[PDB]
Amino acid sequence: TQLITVDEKLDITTLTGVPEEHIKTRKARIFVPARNNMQSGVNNTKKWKMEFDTRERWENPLMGWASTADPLSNLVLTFSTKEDAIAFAEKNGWSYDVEERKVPKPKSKSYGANFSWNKRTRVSTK
Amino acid sequence: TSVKPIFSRDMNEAKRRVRELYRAWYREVPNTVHLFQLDISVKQGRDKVREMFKKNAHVTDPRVVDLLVIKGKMELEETINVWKQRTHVMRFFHETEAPRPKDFLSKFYVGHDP
Amino acid sequence: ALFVHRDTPKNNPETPFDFTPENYKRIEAIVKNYPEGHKAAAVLPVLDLAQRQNGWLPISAMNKVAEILQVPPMRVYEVATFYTMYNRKP
Amino acid sequence: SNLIEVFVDGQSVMVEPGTTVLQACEKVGMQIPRFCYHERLSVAGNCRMCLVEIEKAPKVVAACAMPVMKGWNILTNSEKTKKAREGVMEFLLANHPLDCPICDQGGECDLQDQSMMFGSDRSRFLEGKRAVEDKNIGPLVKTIMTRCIQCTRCIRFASEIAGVDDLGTTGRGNDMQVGTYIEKMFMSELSGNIIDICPVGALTSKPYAFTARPWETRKTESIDVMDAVGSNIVVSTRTGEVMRILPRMHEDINEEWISDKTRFAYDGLKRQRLTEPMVRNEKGLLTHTTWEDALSRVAGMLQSCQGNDVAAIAGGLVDAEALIALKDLLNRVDSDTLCTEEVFPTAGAGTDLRSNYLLNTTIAGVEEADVVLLVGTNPRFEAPLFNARIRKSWLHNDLKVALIGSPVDLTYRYDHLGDSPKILQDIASGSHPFSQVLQEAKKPMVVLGSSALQRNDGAAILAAVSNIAQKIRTSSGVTGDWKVMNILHRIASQVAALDLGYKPGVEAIRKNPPKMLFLLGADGGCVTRQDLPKDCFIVYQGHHGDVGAPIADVILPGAAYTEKSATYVNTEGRAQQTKVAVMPPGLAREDWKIIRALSEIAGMTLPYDTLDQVRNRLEEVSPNLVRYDDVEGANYFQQASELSKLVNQQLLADPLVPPQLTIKDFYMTDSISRASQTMAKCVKAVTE
Amino acid sequence: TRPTVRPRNDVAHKQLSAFGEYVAEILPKYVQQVQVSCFSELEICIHPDGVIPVLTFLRDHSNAQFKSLADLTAVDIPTRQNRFEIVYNLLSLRFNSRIRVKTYTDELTPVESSVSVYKAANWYEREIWDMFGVFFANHPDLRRILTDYGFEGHPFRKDFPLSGYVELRYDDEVKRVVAEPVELAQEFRKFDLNSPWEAFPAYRQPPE
Amino acid sequence: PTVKPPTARKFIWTNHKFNLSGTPQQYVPYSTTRKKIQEWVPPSTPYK
Amino acid sequence: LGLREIRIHLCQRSPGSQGVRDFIEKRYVELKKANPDLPILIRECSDVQPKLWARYAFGQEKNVSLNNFSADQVTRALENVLSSKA
Amino acid sequence: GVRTSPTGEKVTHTGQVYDDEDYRRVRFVGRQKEVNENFAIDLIAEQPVSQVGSRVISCDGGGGALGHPRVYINLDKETKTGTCGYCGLQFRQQH
Ligand code: SF4
Ligand code: SF4
Ligand code: FES
Ligand SMILES: [K+]
Numbered sequence A: 001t002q003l004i005t006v007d008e009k010l011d012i013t014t015l016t017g018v019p020e021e022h023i024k025t026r027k028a029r030i031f032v033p034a035r036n037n038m039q040s041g042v043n044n045t046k047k048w049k050m051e052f053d054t055r056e057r058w059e060n061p062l063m064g065w066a067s068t069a070d071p072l073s074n075l076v077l078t079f080s081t082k083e084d085a086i087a088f089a090e091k092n093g094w095s096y097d098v099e100e101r102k103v104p105k106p107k108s109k110s111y112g113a114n115f116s117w118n119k120r121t122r123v124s125t126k
Numbered sequence B: 001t002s003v004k005p006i007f008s009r010d011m012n013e014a015k016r017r018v019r020e021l022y023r024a025w026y027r028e029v030p031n032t033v034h035l036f037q038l039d040i041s042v043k044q045g046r047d048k049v050r051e052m053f054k055k056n057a058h059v060t061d062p063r064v065v066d067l068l069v070i071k072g073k074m075e076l077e078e079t080i081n082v083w084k085q086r087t088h089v090m091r092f093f094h095e096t097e098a099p100r101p102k103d104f105l106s107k108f109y110v111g112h113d114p
Numbered sequence C: 001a002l003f004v005h006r007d008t009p010k011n012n013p014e015t016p017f018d019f020t021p022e023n024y025k026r027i028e029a030i031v032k033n034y035p036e037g038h039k040a041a042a043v044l045p046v047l048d049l050a051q052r053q054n055g056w057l058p059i060s061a062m063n064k065v066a067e068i069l070q071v072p073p074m075r076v077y078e079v080a081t082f083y084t085m086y087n088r089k090p
Numbered sequence D: 001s002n003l004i005e006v007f008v009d010g011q012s013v014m015v016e017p018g019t020t021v022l023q024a025c026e027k028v029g030m031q032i033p034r035f036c037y038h039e040r041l042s043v044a045g046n047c048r049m050c051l052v053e054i055e056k057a058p059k060v061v062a063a064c065a066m067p068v069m070k071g072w073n074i075l076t077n078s079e080k081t082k083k084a085r086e087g088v089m090e091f092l093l094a095n096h097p098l099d100c101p102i103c104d105q106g107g108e109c110d111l112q113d114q115s116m117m118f119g120s121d122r123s124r125f126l127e128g129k130r131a132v133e134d135k136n137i138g139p140l141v142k143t144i145m146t147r148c149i150q151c152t153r154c155i156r157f158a159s160e161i162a163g164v165d166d167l168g169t170t171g172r173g174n175d176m177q178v179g180t181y182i183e184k185m186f187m188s189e190l191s192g193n194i195i196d197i198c199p200v201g202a203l204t205s206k207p208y209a210f211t212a213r214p215w216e217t218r219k220t221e222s223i224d225v226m227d228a229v230g231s232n233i234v235v236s237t238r239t240g241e242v243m244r245i246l247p248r249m250h251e252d253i254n255e256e257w258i259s260d261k262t263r264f265a266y267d268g269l270k271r272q273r274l275t276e277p278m279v280r281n282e283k284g285l286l287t288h289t290t291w292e293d294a295l296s297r298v299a300g301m302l303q304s305c306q307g308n309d310v311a312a313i314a315g316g317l318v319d320a321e322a323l324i325a326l327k328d329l330l331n332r333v334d335s336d337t338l339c340t341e342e343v344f345p346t347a348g349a350g351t352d353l354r355s356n357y358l359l360n361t362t363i364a365g366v367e368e369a370d371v372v373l374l375v376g377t378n379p380r381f382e383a384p385l386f387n388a389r390i391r392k393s394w395l396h397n398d399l400k401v402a403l404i405g406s407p408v409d410l411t412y413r414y415d416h417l418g419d420s421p422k423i424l425q426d427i428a429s430g431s432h433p434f435s436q437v438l439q440e441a442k443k444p445m446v447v448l449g450s451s452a453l454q455r456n457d458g459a460a461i462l463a464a465v466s467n468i469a470q471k472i473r474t475s476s477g478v479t480g481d482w483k484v485m486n487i488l489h490r491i492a493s494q495v496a497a498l499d500l501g502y503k504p505g506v507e508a509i510r511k512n513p514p515k516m517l518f519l520l521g522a523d524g525g526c527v528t529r530q531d532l533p534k535d536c537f538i539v540y541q542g543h544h545g546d547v548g549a550p551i552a553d554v555i556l557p558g559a560a561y562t563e564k565s566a567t568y569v570n571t572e573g574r575a576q577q578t579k580v581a582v583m584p585p586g587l588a589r590e591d592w593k594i595i596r597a598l599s600e601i602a603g604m605t606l607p608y609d610t611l612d613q614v615r616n617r618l619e620e621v622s623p624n625l626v627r628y629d630d631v632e633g634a635n636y637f638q639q640a641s642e643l644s645k646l647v648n649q650q651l652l653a654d655p656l657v658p659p660q661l662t663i664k665d666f667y668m669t670d671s672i673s674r675a676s677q678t679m680a681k682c683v684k685a686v687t688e
Numbered sequence E: 001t002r003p004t005v006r007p008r009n010d011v012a013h014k015q016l017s018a019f020g021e022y023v024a025e026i027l028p029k030y031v032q033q034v035q036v037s038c039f040s041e042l043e044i045c046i047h048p049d050g051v052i053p054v055l056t057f058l059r060d061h062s063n064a065q066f067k068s069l070a071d072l073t074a075v076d077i078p079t080r081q082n083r084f085e086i087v088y089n090l091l092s093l094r095f096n097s098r099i100r101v102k103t104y105t106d107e108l109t110p111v112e113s114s115v116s117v118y119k120a121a122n123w124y125e126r127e128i129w130d131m132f133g134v135f136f137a138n139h140p141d142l143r144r145i146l147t148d149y150g151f152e153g154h155p156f157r158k159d160f161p162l163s164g165y166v167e168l169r170y171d172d173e174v175k176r177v178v179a180e181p182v183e184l185a186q187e188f189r190k191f192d193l194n195s196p197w198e199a200f201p202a203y204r205q206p207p208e
Numbered sequence F: 001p002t003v004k005p006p007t008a009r010k011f012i013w014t015n016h017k018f019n020l021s022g023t024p025q026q027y028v029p030y031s032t033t034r035k036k037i038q039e040w041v042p043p044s045t046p047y048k
Numbered sequence G: 001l002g003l004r005e006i007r008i009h010l011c012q013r014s015p016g017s018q019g020v021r022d023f024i025e026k027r028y029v030e031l032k033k034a035n036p037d038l039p040i041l042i043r044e045c046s047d048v049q050p051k052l053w054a055r056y057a058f059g060q061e062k063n064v065s066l067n068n069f070s071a072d073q074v075t076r077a078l079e080n081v082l083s084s085k086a
Numbered sequence H: 001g002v003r004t005s006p007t008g009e010k011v012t013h014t015g016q017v018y019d020d021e022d023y024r025r026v027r028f029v030g031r032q033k034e035v036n037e038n039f040a041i042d043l044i045a046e047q048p049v050s051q052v053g054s055r056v057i058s059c060d061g062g063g064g065a066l067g068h069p070r071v072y073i074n075l076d077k078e079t080k081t082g083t084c085g086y087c088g089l090q091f092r093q094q095h
């Protein structure tokens, strides 16, 4: 045989050493990051990301630095699909929420439309 | 759904290993309080043993509780052999940590955390 | 030699410019050479007509050509700074 | 299908006829480099960075402009495509200034990034570079025109989307410059978006100037609350401080643009802030105190109240969580008097059916319409990207727009019908010329402004507009999927407050005045202490001390929209959620946390502890408040219209004047914008 | 492409491709992929049931003689359902060559310990227990090797934070070094560095 | 520096100082930025 | 002490909401004319089951599942709500 | 160009000074607040404006490779001088 059947839901929260405060109070966010509108490139909108809810950052009394108490503050996980991220969030007991991938819709472009006979889509300058 | 086991075929052998591990910790605790010269009692250390076992009592997967028995035996092996110091044994007892606010109201008073 | 306008007292949007009425009849003849709906095509002759009356183009001739042809003023400033004949200094 | 087959590097792809080369390469996941191409602007073709080899053709083609012919093999990575890209990048960088350290675009520069990815590693330009005179186009856009690469996205945005026609090119050749040619100030409601699409640092943000840098910023995705459009934004922070607000692309809302209030009112989010709880002392002054003292002094008054003794005014920026928190808290004292500042008429169906207070078509449905009728609104400033979508439908679909109201500038041409509301009866009776225009149309769209509903005859105006919409829809050739009746809102808290069953307007408070009044961010000045009895216990809960906080007895410092995860519903019914970007300053807290802690002090503890349980309650009152980025269809226009025919409210003789006529009145509407120094510079710039 | 480009070694590429075919056809029971990189390194991606049959073969076959275990590694790739990638690096001193034997596991599936093939692995996969939580069955003394004795979690997992969850300080009250939930006076500043433009079109993945 | 003197600048210290640690003339660190969030100052007049 | 609001949740397209839909197309209007100062909030949603929330004095809420009901059954449940007033 | 708050504390070239009711002045009690007294905004304003006969000038900060990257400053505006974005040296077209 050398194989057993486990029909249970996969849960490894007792094995990952994570304190319970950072399991049952954190909200994982599964999302494709939006394209930076400073730029036209789309190579950052290719993958799924799991981030967490941001916690308190306060002013260090000595230097004014951003002191934190959140260990999961810098934790960004990268996934190829949505279902991989959902399986990884459910595997670790993180309550998550999922945004859908927003693609730009197919535009209808025409350089000749800049110079129409009767339509408003004429350019007045070029 | 057909996975490879670690030690236990199902939950019965797994609970047997859990039960032997609890026996070994219960036997070890007075020696731990003696040779580390802890400032706790044997009743208190055995209550911490029972707390660490009953924390993981909700698990229904044989492989997960196999790995929990493996890691508990590693903790016990590091305690019987004097590999931990007194500090590592007393990290189970969060003595210097202030008590956290448990209700809604005092968590509202002290900060932003849910 | 510059392509930005700075308001001087002799070149400002209140420098007096207006076409003569015979120049308005000439502008009507210019606008009738183009299809209805493309009155903007008469920017280059009428603006040159504004140079043939005044000798050069203050920025009220540009504004008058923009106003009587109902085009934006920037669309006249582009024509006045693109073409080397429009004298933007006297 | 009539799809033609083309090849990108040998990979077959089936494209619609008219598709450009760049879009055909986009369909296989390749991104051709570009500087002047933008998918929401017209095709320019004047940077030549997108030049790509079609094989068996001895000339590269501008992929942004060239349509694919059937059978082309687009060589996106052949040798002469790469030589074209390096040559064009060499000419772009020949006269470009060595400003990359002192430039705000550094790190997020298209020119830097595709110089790294597609151009040479070094220079052959042994000459002197040109230097362009800077321009002054306002307090929002810093202008350093030496960095300009003449891509004309300025001009195509200002002409085609903002509809302004003030930017242009003067000169000729290498001396050609971008600007207004005069000292003219480019102040649109969409003027800051030219900061976004400028690929170089020639146009930068003057408020954001020099403060941060893109790699060190954290990007929280969130929702605008400055209007009821519900623009998706990126709040970019750095070390716990909000640095700037960028747009997120959402095709159905704000395509990738935001308004200038959305972009620049974030510096009002750090002035005038309520950080600590305040109570009145023995001398009548607001003094700082603890949360225990403030919540005890509010709960001791709330326990003495019952019935109509306690009321509530919700403000313009309040999330739905605090709305249902305060509703359940006042329902425990048996008080239904929970009101909004913005009046919606409760005549007929009222807020019962969702259809008679939504933008029922969509923001996207404006692209499907062919006649848009606007009544009593100035949608340019009340909802600037709803107006931007109207202008896009105007420009591309040949949309016919009409307006009933004052002849405002909407950045396009409309058929001004007149400012009298009696025209709403002349179209409904069919004696008006535009009535047949509405009848013969196939996708008509009648939008009523919610600012016109602030008039005393708002029920009569809503009845007339619904009468027109049901005259069209039930008689003419409207299919039934198409929604005609639409209401445009201006307040982010309004639609979530109407879905939760508040009573819109403060008629329920002026009728019987309470001895205790809650103000969730109520800074509209609607109900002052001249309206209340002698000693009303006014509790202000909010994030700014603007209007309602100087008259309060106890102040409860709340979270702003960047400081809490918070459900807001736009004018089309789409529920959305912000995320936490920074935390509230000082002892300030999240709003429903404050209301729930008050309910635990008052001994009427609400049945929720965390945000998910608040949202379970929020689903219990209306389950569309937990279905995010989802417009739910609202039926039953017939039944709301049959209820609207009952009471015959009389139309007044006052003409429809929106409260916002010029750009002067655009920049300050709420407590965040009035506390902004950037908005003050905008107002001072447009008034002079 | 003479001065600045790395010169391609075609002879070693051909020889490693041929030996990869050799291993793939001697051991079809376990070998899943065979690949050779452009810088001429051979990867043999196998099924985890064949850790002992493959690695003994490469240790003992007269045309392999990979008598040296250079390195043993795990790689955590969380988007894979078998998120841990166990990487063996072998050296043949006889044939002057290196091979890479890659396999997979998740948190709950034990890998068979390769201490019976290479004793070198005795600490290495022990490190893989300490850093990743990959269990190795029939290991002689499997325990932690690098983390502190009371350490909870496995640090080189990628869902594990850069700082831990606890930090130590000396406490004068209990006269003891104590562990407390971690607070940093300056948070580690996350830098989003990735350019939005594609760098390597040879590695472009096909779209959905 | 008797042969090759250093390049004179007006901002260079004319008086060199040794290691001042452990003295009242020592460096004490502080944040050099101003205040981020402004607080709402309530009105000093009564409200009735 | 008395009823305060009525909430009717329903789908637009699910068949289980069908009678609830048939309750609103015919019998809502003369309902609303009979109770002009009572908020009867109709909330359509995507895939919800039909439901009738009654809120009474002091925040008490009763809950009646209107799933798969005919319009007469919806009418009888709603008039039980209007006549009970607990 | 240093000045002093009413608490007796020096105000930096940034403008940082603690409030009177701020406790964090206790770190300078028995010690000193270290400020730099050569304010760069006052030192660059002492530099005389360079009169040049060209329309565009180049500036590298002086020293060639020891300065900043060489930029090109336009001088068409006679209302305003043209300032180096790195070094702050300002220029005027003498015509
Ligand atoms: S626009 Fe880009 S390339 Fe030009 S100076 Fe700024 S960062 Fe450098
Ligand atoms: S300023 Fe920017 S957007 Fe405008 S033309 Fe120049 S490079 Fe293009
Ligand atoms: S992108 Fe096609 S030429 Fe500018
Ligand atoms: K820019």
Ligand SMILES: [Zn+2]
Binding pocket: H059, H060, H061, H062, H068, H084, H085, H086, H087, H088, H089
């Ligand atoms: Zn310089």
